[PDB]
Design a protein around this ligand. Structure first.
Ligand SMILES: O=C(COP(=O)(O)O)N(O)CCCCOP(=O)(O)O
Ligand SMILES: O=C(COP(=O)(O)O)N(O)CCCCOP(=O)(O)O
Ligand code: NA
Ligand code: NA
Ligand code: NA
Ligand code: NA
Ligand SMILES: [Zn+2]
Ligand SMILES: [Zn+2]
Lengths: 329, 329
C-alpha cells in the first residue's frame, strides 16, 4: 500500500535506528512506477517513488506540460497499483527550487492539506525544497514557512544545504539545527552535500566525503546538548547512481535514510529496449517492402523488458542500502 | 474532460447523424494515453481511449498482472490528465471473451455501479463483450444480462456478432434487435463483421463488404416499423489500422460511429524509438569502455518522440474519420 504518514515516519525511524536506508527511485510514467514497486516488493522492502519537476512535466504529457497535473496523475496511478503489493511505498517530489514552489510544491501541499482536513491522508508523504542555490539563511527562512505547511498536511519536508553537482560546512549544520530544530517543529530530511553529483561518470571522478555527515551529527548533537553519538539529522544521499558500495556503507553509518537513484535505473530501463530494437531490427522497421512484425513493434514487447530490467536494478539498490527484507509488513 | 455518460451519448449521437466516427485508440500506459489525448486535442476532436485485456494486464505491472487493477489505475491517471483538455475523452475496454468476463468486465461494471449509486459518474463509459467465439444465441443471452448491468451503471455496452480475423448474416441482425432492442433497453454499439481483420498487412489482403452494414440497418428498420433511412444500429469498425479511404468513407455512411485503431499507432509509437536507438547506439549503450550518454538513455528523450509520433497518427485517424474539428466543446 501507499505509506500513510505514520508508517512513513516509522519506516524512516527504523531505518535510522538500524543504519539502513531506502532507495528513492525517480519515476516518469506508469511503466517506471510499476518497475520500481515490483523492485521493492521483490526485495521484500519498503521504498520511495519520486517525481522530479521534469519528470512530472513529462508525465502530464506534451499536450499539458504542467508539473502539478503530471505529479497528481502519476500519484493517483500509483495509489491504485501500490494497493496490490504488501510493501509500503511512499511518494515524494524531488528538487523544487524557489521559482518553482508556486507551480509545484505549494499547490501539491494544498491538495494534501485538503485531503487531510477531510479525515484522509496526503497524496504525497514528502516534498523536497531545494534552496541550495540561495544563501543558507534565505534557504532556511523559506524552509521554516514550508515546514509549517508540511506539518499541517502530515508531510515530511526534505531540504538541501550545499550543492549537488552535474561540501557542506560545520556552520551550516549549526544554522540548520538552530532554525529547524531536531524535529519538534515537524520532521524533515536533510540533504547535505558531501561531494555528491547527479549522473554517472568514469568511476573515481566523483569524490565523496561521508565524514562531513559524521561531523554534522556531532555538531548538531553538541548544539542540542545530546549524546556525542547522537544522530539528530536524517540525511538524504543525492546522486546515488554509480556510487561505490563502501561509500554507501559509510554514509549509512552517519544517518543516511534515503538515497536517490535515477541515472542507473534510467540506464537499466533503456538498455534492453536498445537491445530489442537491434536484434529485431527487421520486425520493428518495415524493411525491403515487408510490413514489419507486429509482435515486436508492439510497445509492450520491449517495455516489459525495460520494466523487468529496471526492477532488477531496484532490487540491487535495496541490497546496497540494506533495506532488503526489512518491510514493516 | 472525461466524457460523462450524457456527452458520450451525444458524441455518438452527433457522429451518427452527421456520418462521422471516433478513433478508439488502444493505450497501455501513461505515455500512450497522453499521446492519444494530445492527438484528439490537436485534431479538435473528441475521442475514445480503450484498454484491452492485455493492455490492462500490462498496465498493472509485471508484479501484479491483474486486469481490473491495470484498467482502474490507467483510468484514474486518465481522469486527471483529461481534465486539462477542452475535448471529451471516453474510456472504453476492448475485447473481453466469455472466460474473462468475471475477471474484467463484470468487476469493472460493479466498480462503476457503486460510483453511480453514490451519485457520481462511471469510471469507464463503455465496455466490450466479445461473444464472437460462441454461438449467436448464447452471445445474445449473455449480452442481455450484461446490457441491464451496463445500463444501470450508465455505461454503453459494445457487442460483437460474427468474427474479427487476425461476414455477418442478415438474420443475425434480426436476432440482435430481437434480443436487445434498438436502445430502449439500454444503448449498445454493434460490431458486425463485414470482413475486418486485426493488424496491418500487404494491401489487397483484407476485403471488406461495408454494404452488409447498410443491409443490417435497412433490415432492422423494417422489422421495427421505422422509415427505410433509419439507422437503429450504432456500428463499430474493428481492424481500423491500414484500412482504405474509400471503405472507411463508405462505412461512415452506414452508421459506423467508432473505429478501433491499434496496430498503426503502435508502429507510430515504436518507429522513432527504433530510430533513436540506432542513431544514438553509442550513447544508449556503454561502448568501448565509455559510460554512455545520459541525455539519450534518459527514457524521456525517446519517449517524447514516440508520444509525438503517435499523436500525429491519431490526428491522421481523426482526419480520416471526419471527426476532426467536431469536438462538442
Ligand atoms: O539524486 C538524484 C539522482 O541521482 P542519480 O541520477 O546519479 O542516480 N535525484 O535527485 C534525481 C535527479 C532528478 C533530476 O531532474 P530531471 O528529471 O529533469 O533529470
Ligand atoms: O480493432 C482493434 C484494432 O485493430 P488494428 O490493430 O488493425 O488497428 N482493436 O480492438 C484493438 C486490438 C486489441 C489488442 O489485443 P491485446 O492487446 O489484448 O493483445
Ligand atoms: Na529528493
Ligand atoms: Na519537490
Ligand atoms: Na550519481
Ligand atoms: Na487492421
Ligand atoms: Zn538530487
Ligand atoms: Zn477489435
Amino acid at each position: 500500500p501507499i505509506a500513510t504518514p505514520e508508517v512513513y515516519a516509522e519506516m524512516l525511524g527504523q531505518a535510522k535506528q538500524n543504519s539502513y536506508a531506502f532507495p528513492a527511485i525517480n519515476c516518469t510514467s506508469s511503466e517506471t512506477v510499476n518497475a520500481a514497486i515490483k523492485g521493492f516488493a521483490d526485495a521484500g522492502s519498503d521504498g520511495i517513488i519520486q517525481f522530479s519537476t521534469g519528470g512530472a512535466e513529462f508525465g502530464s504529457g506534451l499536450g499539458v506540460k504542467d508539473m502539478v497535473t503530471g505529479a497528481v496523475a502519476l500519484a493517483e496511478f500509483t495509489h491504485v497499483i501500490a494497493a496490490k503489493y504488501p510493501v509500503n511505498v511512499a511518494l515524494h517530489t524531488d528538487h523544487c527550487p524557489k521559482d518553482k514552489l508556486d507551480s509545484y510544491v505549494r499547490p501539491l501541499l494544498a491538495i494534501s492539506a485538503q485531503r487531510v482536513s477531510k479525515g484522509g491522508n496526503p497524496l504525497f508523504q514528502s516534498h523536497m525544497w531545494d534552496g541550495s542555490a540561495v544563501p543558507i539563511d534565505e534557504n532556511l527562512a523559506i524552509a521554516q514557512e514550508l515546514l509549517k505547511a508540511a506539518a499541517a498536511a502530515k508531510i515530511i519536508l526534505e531540504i538541501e544545504i550545499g550543492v549537488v553537482g552535474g561540501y557542506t560546512s560545520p556552520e551550516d549544520f549549526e544554522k540548520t539545527i538552530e532554525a529547524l530544530g531536531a524535529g519538534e517543529h515537524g520532521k524533515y530530511l536533510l540533504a547535505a552535500t558531501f561531494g555528491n553529483v547527479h549522473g554517472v561518470y568514469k568511476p573515481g571522478n566523483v569524490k565523496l566525503r561521508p565524514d562531513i555527515l559524521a561531523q554534522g551529527q556531532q555538531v548538531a548533537a553538541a548544539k542540542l546538548g545530546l549524546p556525542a553519538d547522537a544522530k539528530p539529522f536524517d540525511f538524504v544521499f543525492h546522486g546515488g547512481s554509480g556510487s561505490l558500495k563502501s561509500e554507501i556503507e559509510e554514509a549509512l553509518r552517519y544517518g543516511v535514510v534515503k538515497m536517490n537513484v535515477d541515472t542507473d535505473t534510467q540506464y537499466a530501463f533503456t538498455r534492453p529496449i536498445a537491445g530489442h530494437m537491434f536484434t529485431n531490427y527487421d520486425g520493428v522497421l518495415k524493411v525491403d517492402g515487408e510490413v514489419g512484425v507486429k509482435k515486436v513493434y508492439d510497445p509492450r514487447s520491449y517495455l516489459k523488458k525495460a520494466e523487468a530490467s529496471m526492477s532488477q536494478r531496484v532490487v540491487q539498490a535495496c541490497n546496497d542500502l540494506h533495506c532488503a527484507g526489512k518491510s514493516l509488513t
